[PDB]
Amino acid sequence: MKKDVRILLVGEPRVGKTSLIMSLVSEEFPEEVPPRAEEITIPADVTPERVPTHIVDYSEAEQSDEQLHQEISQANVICIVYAVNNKHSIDKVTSRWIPLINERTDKDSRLPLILVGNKSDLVEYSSMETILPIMNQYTEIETCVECSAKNLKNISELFYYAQKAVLHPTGPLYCPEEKEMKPACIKALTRIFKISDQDNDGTLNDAELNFFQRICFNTPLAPQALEDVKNVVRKHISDGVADSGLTLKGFLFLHTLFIQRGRHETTWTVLRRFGYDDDLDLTPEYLFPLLKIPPDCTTELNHHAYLFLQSTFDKHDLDRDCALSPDELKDLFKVFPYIPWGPDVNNTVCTNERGWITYQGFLSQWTLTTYLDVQRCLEYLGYLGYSILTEQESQASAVTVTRDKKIDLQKKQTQRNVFRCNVIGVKNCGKSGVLQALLGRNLMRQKKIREDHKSYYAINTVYVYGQEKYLLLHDISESEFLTEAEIICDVVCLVYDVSNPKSFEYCARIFKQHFMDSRIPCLIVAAKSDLHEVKQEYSISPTDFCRKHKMPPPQAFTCNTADAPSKDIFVKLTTMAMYPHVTQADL
Amino acid sequence: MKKDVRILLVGEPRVGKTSLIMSLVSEEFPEEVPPRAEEITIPADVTPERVPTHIVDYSEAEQSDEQLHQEISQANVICIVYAVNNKHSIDKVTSRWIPLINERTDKDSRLPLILVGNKSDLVEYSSMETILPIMNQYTEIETCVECSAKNLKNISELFYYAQKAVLHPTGPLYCPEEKEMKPACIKALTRIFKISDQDNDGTLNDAELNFFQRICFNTPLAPQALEDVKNVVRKHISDGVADSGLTLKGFLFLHTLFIQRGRHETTWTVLRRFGYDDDLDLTPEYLFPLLKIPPDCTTELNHHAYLFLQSTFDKHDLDRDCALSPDELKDLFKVFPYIPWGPDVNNTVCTNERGWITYQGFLSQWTLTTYLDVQRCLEYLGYLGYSILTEQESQASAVTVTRDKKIDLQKKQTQRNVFRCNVIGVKNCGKSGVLQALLGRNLMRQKKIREDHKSYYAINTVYVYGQEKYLLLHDISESEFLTEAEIICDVVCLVYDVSNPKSFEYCARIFKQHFMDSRIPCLIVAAKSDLHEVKQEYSISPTDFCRKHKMPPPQAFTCNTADAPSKDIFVKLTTMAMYPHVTQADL
Amino acid sequence: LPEKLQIVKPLEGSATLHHWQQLAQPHLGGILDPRPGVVTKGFR
Amino acid sequence: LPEKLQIVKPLEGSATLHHWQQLAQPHLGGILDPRPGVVTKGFR
Numbered sequence A, B: 001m002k003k004d005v006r007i008l009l010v011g012e013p014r015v016g017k018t019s020l021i022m023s024l025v026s027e028e029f030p031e032e033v034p035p036r037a038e039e040i041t042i043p044a045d046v047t048p049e050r051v052p053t054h055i056v057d058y059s060e061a062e063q064s065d066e067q068l069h070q071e072i073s074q075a076n077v078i079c080i081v082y083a084v085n086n087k088h089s090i091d092k093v094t095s096r097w098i099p100l101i102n103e104r105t106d107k108d109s110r111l112p113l114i115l116v117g118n119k120s121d122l123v124e125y126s127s128m129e130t131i132l133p134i135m136n137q138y139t140e141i142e143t144c145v146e147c148s149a150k151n152l153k154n155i156s157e158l159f160y161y162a163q164k165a166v167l168h169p170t171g172p173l174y175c176p177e178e179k180e181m182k183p184a185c186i187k188a189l190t191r192i193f194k195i196s197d198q199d200n201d202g203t204l205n206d207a208e209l210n211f212f213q214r215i216c217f218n219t220p221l222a223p224q225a226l227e228d229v230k231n232v233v234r235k236h237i238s239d240g241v242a243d244s245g246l247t248l249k250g251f252l253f254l255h256t257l258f259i260q261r262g263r264h265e266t267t268w269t270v271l272r273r274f275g276y277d278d279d280l281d282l283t284p285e286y287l288f289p290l291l292k293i294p295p296d297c298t299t300e301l302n303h304h305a306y307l308f309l310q311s312t313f314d315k316h317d318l319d320r321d322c323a324l325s326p327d328e329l330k331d332l333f334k335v336f337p338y339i340p341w342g343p344d345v346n347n348t349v350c351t352n353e354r355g356w357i358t359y360q361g362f363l364s365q366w367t368l369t370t371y372l373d374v375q376r377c378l379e380y381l382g383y384l385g386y387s388i389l390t391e392q393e394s395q396a397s398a399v400t401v402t403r404d405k406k407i408d409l410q411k412k413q414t415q416r417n418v419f420r421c422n423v424i425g426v427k428n429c430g431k432s433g434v435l436q437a438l439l440g441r442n443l444m445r446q447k448k449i450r451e452d453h454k455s456y457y458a459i460n461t462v463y464v465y466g467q468e469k470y471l472l473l474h475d476i477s478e479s480e481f482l483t484e485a486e487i488i489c490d491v492v493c494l495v496y497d498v499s500n501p502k503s504f505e506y507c508a509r510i511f512k513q514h515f516m517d518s519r520i521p522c523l524i525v526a527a528k529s530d531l532h533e534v535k536q537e538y539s540i541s542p543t544d545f546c547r548k549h550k551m552p553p554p555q556a557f558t559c560n561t562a563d564a565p566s567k568d569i570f571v572k573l574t575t576m577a578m579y580p581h582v583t584q585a586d587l
Numbered sequence C, D: 001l002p003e004k005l006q007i008v009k010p011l012e013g014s015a016t017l018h019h020w021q022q023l024a025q026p027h028l029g030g031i032l033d034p035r036p037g038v039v040t041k042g043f044r
């Protein structure tokens, strides 16, 4: 985070600026003092941020102007000390010292300043006359602590308010001219409100607020003072406390009153717990943590993520129709910086009659991002707050890594849940009829889609032997050559055309390129069986070429039925995916 | 581990003991010095153990005798400084200072002492005359560093050898009288040898030694100097380097030469990496780490532990008969403090003809300790070195926690692998015939076991629908009342006697106590069907009382067959364990 | 003895550093609590 | 100014403390390497 904090004290001769440091280190006033103190540094266990603090003194008699310019250049915060039983010091604050700090310093960045008033035990009535122009003159003075070392009046408070200038800045949050918050903090606090609200009513009740106090601040509040918080935000603004509790406007009003009364750390702890930085953006190691993937391994989501996603679906489905409208889908991605899902997703996963994403489609899209590119899935779970709403170390505890493929063929047992199938076939032979029969749509529902929004991937659940699994189909286009990623699969579904005699050439040609030599079980299916069959022009018969190579015999498929198509090919493909050593005669 | 290290320097006036501390902090000799130095402390990033070090000086002119006794009482190591261009100092080392350290100190524990020789730049020939009686007199002097601050001769070496007296002791390892190691370190280094040897030949080759260097010391050795190590241990002892490499005797000889030449840290890093302490015993947080178990959850071993246990079985089966003899079972538990498995285990798990534990019995016993008491399984994997031989954080990464039971009945899907069945029946009705038919033994093999070694638990694998699972049977004895742990199950197997008319009373009585009201699927089986059946004396018929309560119809079982008994009841019990909502009519 | 020598006050056994540690903790129950003798920007 | 004040030498930019850190590291390749001017117990 930060390296070190250096506090520099300046001022007039005979103001007792060394006496404050000596009263801090001695815990009692020393009557006779040296003219300068050493660099007394304070350890990192006094602040929960664990950042050390260096205090350095300056005297004009023992130092030089080049040394003063070097220590002013090597600083982070400057405290200017005046004595209230004097008038030359207040004149020299605006005459020299605020010009001499700003003499060499460029106007791009300025160091924050603290004003210190000493010798307040000598005067009787506490007052403030000449300082109030100077706070109206320069925008860099933010705090005007008045102290006395003889009574020990705010001696352990001055250096804390000097350190809070560096560690907890008021720069990127508050604009003092227009007197509201900056819009980056406005956008940075609407997202925290939607994560902590767990039922989407628009209000925070007493149950979610204690969760917020236990996560952010620790040791949560007494049950009486929360109504005092609710009473003061009910008094100062009309649209604050609702029937359930705080709204978004009361939350933002409480945080801007915490900004403009001076307690900066209570909102900086809130924005630093949820993952932001000093520039109000989401950090690395929160969006992108480290996960190791061995070769020939797959990623899966465990049972903890499959309750969080279900609770998100049950949170954002307001009308209880078990479907997501585009209004509720826009409400789902308001915590995201950009919309992750395009119009391609609605043709990939299962849907209802109108064209809305259903329950199993919402699970199957999340069981598709994790299989292909796992870093996008750990990025997408970080926006919703997986590590916050479920108390875990990071986003990487949701993904489990399964066994190797070769050990699973060696020991003849598999524990996996997701299986990839590759569809290789000739163009214009109804491959997309096969990939849209897994989703339950016939040809009359296939005809009313646009070619501009077209998918190559499909995924749906398949029940075999009472057990629920996931089947994924990929359409490999006709290319005349295949790369390595088009070889990696578990089964393939080679499709031929019964109307075209040429087609059983090409797929069998693909079966002679890279697929017979590896031990991959494979299936041959026949498409458009509703049309009249014509005899193929290949040398060996397709049934004979199938039965020669130890294959299961070829099935039949048509998508011209009036109702939903039969799910019988995909059950056999999943069954061959689980048990590659079980030949269909051995079953 | 430790709090702080305090080094105290004593000696005569005008020996330059302050000049060593000033030459350490100034990195150059100061010609004029103050008579005393302050408590200059050295931070924790200079030693990998991360323990701070305090250096304190003493002068007789500025201090007092009570202050000297208090600082000698508040110390850990004392360095006594003599000047070699003097003879009064060597006299005062044995006259006062070694008596004055040992004046108040009890004889139970002594602080270690370092002897320092200064002013060696004045003399010409380095020699050692009068010190060699004193090392032969007191056993507490261990190091005799001679130094000079003018040439900077071993100034950064004296305080390291003083700190190594506290952090890396020679006390519990080496006995200087008989000149061998203590037997706790002898037993503490035989166990490290067997874990690092991964093929049980009795030797360490070049492959395992690089694994040992990478785990223990980091940045492993060059490929040329390992033959120099092997050459010097081949020279100094005859039974050292074998054909493959180092044996146990060469390993112990290398470690005792590292002890008796002074490099104590190389063996302390080895015994501290594998889990031991300063008292040479295994520590908590290594044997007993923390794992949280939610209520109504079960423990399982993942796929990483099911390769480590298989590699242990393939390591310790020398004759390759796929069975463990009691000689190899005694060789397996030589790294254990006590023998974990009694004679009860051979009647619990599967065995061969002679009575030896087989492959699946060795896996099934490890899938029984983890289900019942998980802390004993994380203790037992810590002796074999699961965290060392597979680079992981602890022993708790091998155990995974499954879903709740109630969510699994709610969503009608289970992902578990181990199922518990309870056997409730009348005494002398062949319950142990049922629990020893899962293991494949008939009545003729049942008759040749002793009643003194008798089991109540059984576990074996059951294949259903092509998938391998574990079935566990527990025999609940006749008690007339059942506790809570005898209610917790997945299925039960209520057995009745066809020879005794009373028996179907009692089991059905148990079915009216605590088991009908909960949604637990249950099975009724008939025993000793080889004998002649007699009609039961209950009011309703057993088939009618079975068919009234929505139950599957009662099976038949006899163990009087000549061959192995049929595994058909247990497949049905596992099938009812997986699918409690599937009634046998719905299948 | 040069000026490259850090002088460290220890934390334990100190009252002012304990006051620093207790004002350093973030809690939302400071909405009522005043403090004398400091004026900040936008203070009410 | 009392005697309860720790004076801390920093690690960085020091040669003797770097020598302390380099002799502090454990490595098994010190079976050849001598060192002058120290005699230990049982030294050969």
Ligand SMILES: Nc1nc2c(ncn2[C@@H]2O[C@H](COP(=O)(O)OP(=O)(O)OP(=O)(O)O)[C@@H](O)[C@H]2O)c(=O)[nH]1
Binding pocket: A012, A013, A014, A015, A016, A017, A018, A019, A020, A030, A031, A032, A033, A034, A035, A036, A058, A059, A060, A118, A119, A120, A121, A122, A147, A148, A149, A150
């Ligand atoms: N009543 C009262 N007297 C104070 C207070 N602080 C300092 N003094 C007295 O004012 C005198 C002058 O303060 P010094 O600390 O010596 O002046 P200085 O800060 O060292 O200024 P330089 O000479 O430029 O280094 C001290 O001797 C103190 O006795 C205070 O808070 N209250």
Ligand SMILES: Nc1nc2c(ncn2[C@@H]2O[C@H](COP(=O)(O)OP(=O)(O)OP(=O)(O)O)[C@@H](O)[C@H]2O)c(=O)[nH]1
Binding pocket: A426, A427, A428, A429, A430, A431, A432, A433, A443, A528, A529, A530, A531, A557, A558, A559, A560
């Ligand atoms: N009679 C009949 N025609 C079908 C049937 N299935 C698909 N067709 C027609 O055959 C054509 C081929 O379907 P496509 O899915 O477009 O073929 P493709 O090989 O996947 O190539 P793409 O155009 O990229 O999708 C479609 O335009 C349909 O009109 C069927 O079951 N019966």
Ligand SMILES: Nc1nc2c(ncn2[C@@H]2O[C@H](COP(=O)(O)OP(=O)(O)OP(=O)(O)O)[C@@H](O)[C@H]2O)c(=O)[nH]1
Binding pocket: B012, B013, B014, B015, B016, B017, B018, B019, B020, B030, B031, B032, B033, B034, B035, B036, B058, B059, B060, B118, B119, B120, B121, B122, B147, B148, B149, B150
């Ligand atoms: N040649 C040489 N001279 C040394 C060495 N160490 C110290 N001296 C000189 O010996 C003188 C006496 O040492 P001191 O450090 O002053 O004596 P002391 O340790 O303070 O002893 P006390 O008076 O009891 O506190 C110093 O002034 C050094 O100049 C050394 O290693 N080599």
Ligand SMILES: Nc1nc2c(ncn2[C@@H]2O[C@H](COP(=O)(O)OP(=O)(O)OP(=O)(O)O)[C@@H](O)[C@H]2O)c(=O)[nH]1
Binding pocket: B426, B427, B428, B429, B430, B431, B432, B433, B443, B528, B529, B530, B531, B557, B558, B559, B560
């Ligand atoms: N004829 C015949 N006798 C059997 C058969 N099975 C068991 N028996 C006899 O019935 C007796 C009952 O067997 P046990 O296993 O001892 O009965 P239990 O109810 O489990 O009670 P325990 O003594 O604690 O084991 C045995 O002593 C056998 O001799 C069988 O299949 N046929």
Ligand SMILES: [Ca+2]
Binding pocket: A197, A198, A199, A200, A201, A202, A203, A204, A205, A208, A244
């Ligand atoms: Ca709410």
Ligand SMILES: [Ca+2]
Binding pocket: A317, A318, A319, A320, A321, A322, A323, A324, A325, A328
């Ligand atoms: Ca809806």
Ligand SMILES: [Ca+2]
Binding pocket: B197, B198, B199, B200, B201, B202, B203, B204, B205, B208, B244
């Ligand atoms: Ca070996």
Ligand SMILES: [Ca+2]
Binding pocket: B317, B318, B319, B320, B321, B322, B323, B324, B325, B328
């Ligand atoms: Ca054997």
Ligand SMILES: [Mg+2]
Binding pocket: A016, A017, A018, A019, A035, A036, A058, A059
């Ligand atoms: Mg001063």
Ligand SMILES: [Mg+2]
Binding pocket: B016, B017, B018, B019, B035, B036, B058, B059
């Ligand atoms: Mg001295």
